[PDB]
Symmetry: D2
Subunit: 388 residues, 4 copies
């Protein structure tokens, strides 16, 4: 069994992932900076499909227009030399001290206008480079204390910001959609739109909701103790899974951003099963941090492992679903019945149906086991490659 | 300072709260059952406005129609004798073994039809007793294992169920709205619609969304580590806060349902500040469990304390907002600016505005402190009644 | 590959595990009670080595001495007929309402004396049946509120209780040791001795510490977000791992008690690696609850799966440690150096050693990568049976 | 009511607390560096008793001996000019990249010897400045992955390190004790000795345990969902509370280090009640980070608020314990009985005592309520200054 990725697998990486220098709240960098060109080349050699960037990863904050142009031209040449694509881009509205109280929801109105202008400039660049999705991660939108932020006013400001961005895109005629990335906390004590559900709900209040989806990250929903495959199912059900960030997280703690497959391994299996069976066709993007224990050899080993673990889990999920004994077990657990309408006959027929209440044998129904444990042990056996 | 509740304060209690006998996963009941009539009388004497019920709290599961009628007539007489109201009602779709895999999203189709019929019968009763809101808590909708539940199919079934309920209500001409109560886990390993955000998002996919809101519970959002006042702000912003359940919870663990004011006390303060400043006009309902250490005297002491703590926090939040030094601090932290539009001048003017980018002094902006710590210490001083 | 357990594998089960009827805080039993004799027989057929019990699982609370004698005689015959052993026993000091504020640390002194007497009576029975370890799980020792329990007084009472139990055992000449089982919460809001560390620390203050060890449970340390293999390593390091309870838990929430291998699968792998490489020789006991969705067929499927998952992980951990490439990777990550003394040369030599400070090249040291990511991907490959 | 601290209150602050520049994992510094001399002066003016330091906060990493001497002389003059004391000091073994895999438990043996030498040099300085307690926080001792660290070997290395430090102190004749500071995670995925219990247990295996205690931090135990006052009670019970770090934390997430009184306010009340009623006489040290939203005015406001909130809670805990109605409630809840021995009469008398088992009326005992809810509402009323 080997598991070599190819660009057709649509694996992508942010520049800031393999380029993370290892600075954490308690320690200095353990690695030197990587030139974006070198990252593109190394990732292409590993079998990646593409890369993504924040404005500030590519063009140093404060660069002159002429320095701007040269950074972009070198990057473009790297993409041309390797066949790598740029499917997604985003804005850094969190590192510079001016964003210490947020970008779109900063209390200072002048900061909010600046955040919008910085964003628009990068949307134009994203379109130029061929990106299809523009992510917004409002990492500084939130508060450490209750009186610092009136959340209804802040949501008004957030809606206003996204509405203006949609006006811009439509007026310019750009073929790009937005994806909001939720996170419950860190670096703010609580972040606005903390989960996939809150982001989905917010989108429905925007002026042009069809332009907006979610970019969920495995570790972020897990920082709220939530079931990531369930949240992705809800996003797929809503037609809003525009992009996805893959990584690993061990429970409720700081955002670890481990390589994909690390952290909750069974959740990774059910996630891949869901993405492949739903036919999600977008990038498989890894937003991860090689641990700061590693040198550059360990950075590339960690990046390769992201892709490797996806392909192993893809093979095991596929074998699970194709196994005749598993298909029989799904029927024994009535997954087929779950998929049938409860009352296609309609309300009136349901009300008139004595077998649904008056004559329903609740005791006999209650006695039926669901057979879920046998089903779940077949899933475990498939995951571990122990089928017998 | 005294803090006596009156029915005008709109405090309400479920029958199942003061009536909880103390059975937990590891122990037998520590208290005898309470007759609903006796509960109505005792709560009226404490100053409560009303009570709520599950079908099965009022009418024993399996009761004959004639026994049904007598249970209702005695209850009605109790309400008549005391002036107590019944603003909300709900269905028990979780205790009986037939619901072990859910009600609306059970894999067995016959169980799903039964759950709908049991619900409709209680909606009619709720209307008869004057309830304005019908809550749905899908405590068994979910799974312990990944293959047991296809969540997209389950959401189809959940939508189907709520759509049929809305058809029923509209066809009957009833003046009642629905409120979905989220919970992330317990008793299932993961519960569908685990947070206020996921429930809000789901509602937007229903056929008649205006009939549906949320019933958030303080402890449930806290079981996901979320900021409850922030989630309530989002529900208010959306126009969907139809009902609310007040209690206390100490962190991420099993659902404690402590009396209101216990658990996260500062969160209770910011919640009351928000409810009163938004002019929420619905019931202040307590869904709590007197600890099983208590006898009946401690049950009524715990219930009284729920109301007492609300009224103390209401007085402290009001004093905070009325304090001229606090109003000056809110301006120093630019809460006034948060409430002003970022760009009422419009996209084009924003793009043409050199002071928003080209000439914006990012360094000067970054240097401005937000003054949030002084604001939060004034809030602490007000909460503790230590103002100087 | 097959994975059939035999009694030499020392797998054991509590009567209360497969016998759990499915009652949870929100629902009635979904299964009928099992006779202990039938459980012994079914578990023997599955390949179990032995069973464990609480006093009240075997002898109904309040039984007459003569009824007591018959329950024991039937049970003994079942053990004789099957070859099953009883390596551990414990006391129920949590179900009866008299224990609502604890057993050994109840505020009421008469309850504390009763708890000791109930315990001693079962120790005699445990010895008669051949148990080597007596577990104490103080599930009701704790509090929901801060003033209810003075924890220093409560620890005095807890020490007093365990000291008296050790006096009893030594005076009777019994060959039995005690194992304290920690749990952070549930059913009390906070439980005393909440983690393996707190229990280890407490033991050192007892009069005869050598008689006491810990019985850690996978899910309990995980309810505090802790690393279970790390806590077991500390218990092994201390010489105090007398018994262990195996199950699965998905994160910080209510105590799920899933079958072993469910929940955090990578943690299960590192745990088995540690137990087998340390040569832990005690029982592999499963304290788990077959989900209440299951009928009796699913109960036995869940029990079998506990044993199956242990044996698969045992095979994968063994292959990992035996793999020459893994041994080379451990050396590349300097695990060999971790095992060598830092300063066997002694304090004075260390102080005189200029290469340890004055002449140490901190920059060169800092540049060395730890190679942990490659090591961890070899572990992942072994776990998934994907080695190439 | 006013609440002005004086040096007799023994409030202390680390240099790194008010001096935190605001750099977090996602953002640059928002404040300029503070000179230690200026911090000493400002804190003295606020009423602080003293300051603490890491070696590297006072003497820049890599400083020449002569630069070392000047940094110390200026600092000493500041202490002399203000009357401020230095009760505790510690070592930075976490910021420099050489410590990326730990200090005392780094896999590289040469790094471990360096960490010891760096520590010893600062112990000498601590003694010179008058410190009584030397803290060790092993923030890098731990792992992100299971094979990276053999925890039994790592504990051997940790014991070896602390044993050598105790040899040094005793051989030099220094009057200083060590205090180990636990933390469950961050910056490592899991940190060794993650809680107060694990640190207490470890100490008992050291060669000279009387030289070692714990330095618990409010937020750290709360990052594991634990009850901080309960853990402090266990440390007091053991005679090992040598120092304490006060701050605030909102639940299980990244280490917030908010000002004391923020986060879990009721836990802060029960902590102060316990410290004052046990007569803890050590420093009240604040290890906190003024949020990076603040300018220097907000830094000093946050520091003042730490002290203010301690003094308010001290007044409320004292009023609670002195209230005759509270003393009557404590007796109603049998706290007096908790403090009496269970069996001072001895094992034999207990075994012979028919009223402890044979004739004990379990039903009557079970019926007695504990009256904890009334007690806890009196505590709430006292905390909020609402007594009536
Ligand atoms: Mg991301
Ligand atoms: Mg509720
Ligand atoms: Mg157990
Ligand atoms: Mg600290
Ligand atoms: Ni992340
Ligand atoms: Ni609840
Ligand atoms: Ni458990
Ligand atoms: Ni901290």
């Amino acid at each position: 069994m080997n598991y070599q990725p190819t660009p057709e697998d649509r694996f992508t990486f942010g520049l800031w992932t393999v380029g993370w220098q290892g600075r954490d709240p308690f320690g200095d960098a353990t690695r030197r900076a990587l030139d974006p060109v070198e990252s593109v080349r190394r990732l292409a050699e590993l079998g990646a499909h593409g890369v993504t960037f924040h404005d500030d990863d590519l063009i140093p904050f404060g660069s002159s227009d002429s320095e701007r142009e040269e950074h972009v031209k070198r990057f473009r040449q790297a993409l041309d030399d390797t066949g790598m694509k740029v499917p997604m881009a985003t804005t850094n509205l969190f590192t510079h001290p001016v964003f210490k109280d947020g970008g779109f929801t900063a209390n200072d109105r002048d900061v909010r206008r600046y955040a919008l202008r910085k964003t628009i400039r990068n949307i134009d660049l994203a379109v130029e480079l061929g990106a299809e999705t523009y992510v917004a991660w409002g990492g500084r939108e939130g508060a450490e204390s209750g009186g610092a932020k009136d959340v209804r006013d802040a949501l008004d400001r957030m809606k206003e910001a996204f509405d203006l961005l949609g006006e811009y895109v439509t007026s310019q005629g750009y073929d790009i959609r937005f994806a909001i990335e939720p996170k419950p906390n860190e670096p703010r004590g609580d972040i606005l739109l903390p989960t996939v559900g809150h982001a989905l709900a917010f989108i429905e209040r925007l002026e042009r909701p069809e332009l907006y989806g979610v970019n969920p990250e495995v570790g972020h929903e897990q920082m709220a103790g939530l079931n990531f495959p369930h949240g992705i199912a809800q996003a797929l059900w809503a037609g809003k899974l525009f992009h996805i960030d893959l990584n690993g997280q061990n429970g409720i703690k700081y955002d670890q951003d481990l390589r994909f497959g690390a952290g909750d391994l069974r959740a990774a299996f059910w996630l891949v099963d869901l993405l492949e069976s739903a036919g999600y066709s977008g990038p498989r993007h890894f937003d991860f941090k090689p641990p700061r224990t590693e040198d550059f050899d360990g950075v590339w080993a960690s990046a390769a492992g992201c892709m490797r673990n996806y392909l192993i889990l893809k093979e095991r999920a596929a074998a699970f679903r194709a196994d005749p004994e598993v298909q029989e077990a799904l029927r024994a657990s009535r997954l087929d019945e779950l998929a049938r309408p409860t009352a296609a006959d309609g309300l009136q027929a349901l009300l008139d149906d004595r077998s649904a209440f008056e004559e329903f044998d609740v005791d006999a129904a209650a006695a039926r086991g669901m057979a879920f444990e046998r089903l779940d042990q077949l899933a475990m056996d498939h995951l571990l490659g122990a089928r017998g």
